[PDB]
Design a protein around this ligand. Structure first.
Ligand SMILES: CCN(CCn1cccn1)C(=O)Cc1ccc(Oc2ccc(C#N)c(C)c2)cc1
Length: 188
């Protein structure tokens, strides 16, 4: 077959019932995740190749970056609660990996303030139990599939993308192969 288990994707031993339709995991410390956002725009191209209104979920992970890695998961929960993912994703990535100006939770906060989120608004969300629950959902989804590496995408809690099995000579061909595989698994 053109799409084969083990080539463009793998199948989880234990499927996760009730998982989001398209679930991505990333970390701002993850170098390929930087490429996936700034260079390849994987999420946007995947969303485009999916039907209108299909839910896509993107979660941060703790296992990279020690203390600051956990701060960034809580901050991503703040981004999701306020709906400002599209405003902080790039400066958080560049702050961690490019300029390396993010070394504390306050430095993360500065990215949100520079993005236009008010101080009282960020601090209230940061300490809110709505964000606490959002942090738990990110941890629960990662623990559900024993996640040990990022970037990672899961389709309907049963299939895991395998980008190592695609072509990486052409960036644009890789993205299109990746998105078509998500679409293929979506229709399974
Ligand atoms: C979860 C495993 N994991 C972590 C460990 N790890 C580090 C390096 C390799 N593995 C991954 O990063 C897996 C991975 C993902 C994608 C990928 O393919 C490309 C990456 C970037 C670009 C660009 N620009 C292209 C075109 C393709 C290759 C590997």
């Amino acid at each position: 077959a053109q799409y084969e288990d083990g080539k463009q994707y793998t199948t989880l031993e234990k499927p996760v019932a009730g998982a989001p339709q398209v679930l991505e995991f990333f970390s701002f410390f993850c170098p390929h995740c930087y490429q996936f956002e700034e260079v390849l725009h994987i999420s946007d191209n995947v969303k485009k190749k999916l039907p209108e209104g299909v839910k896509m979920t993107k979660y941060h992970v703790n296992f990279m970056g020690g203390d600051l890695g956990k701060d960034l998961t809580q901050a991503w929960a703040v981004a999701m609660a306020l709906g400002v993912e599209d405003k902080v994703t790039v400066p958080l990535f560049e702050g961690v990996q490019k300029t390396q100006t993010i070394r504390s939770a306050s430095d993360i906060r500065d990215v949100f303030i520079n993005a236009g989120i008010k101080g009282e608004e960020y601090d209230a969300a940061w300490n809110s139990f709505v964000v606490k629950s959002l942090v738990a959902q990110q941890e629960k989804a990662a623990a559900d599939v024993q996640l040990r590496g990022v970037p990672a995408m899961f389709v309907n809690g049963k299939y895991q993308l395998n980008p190592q099995g695609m072509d990486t000579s052409n960036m644009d061909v890789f993205v299109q192969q990746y998105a078509d595989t998500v679409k293929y698994l979506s229709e399974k």
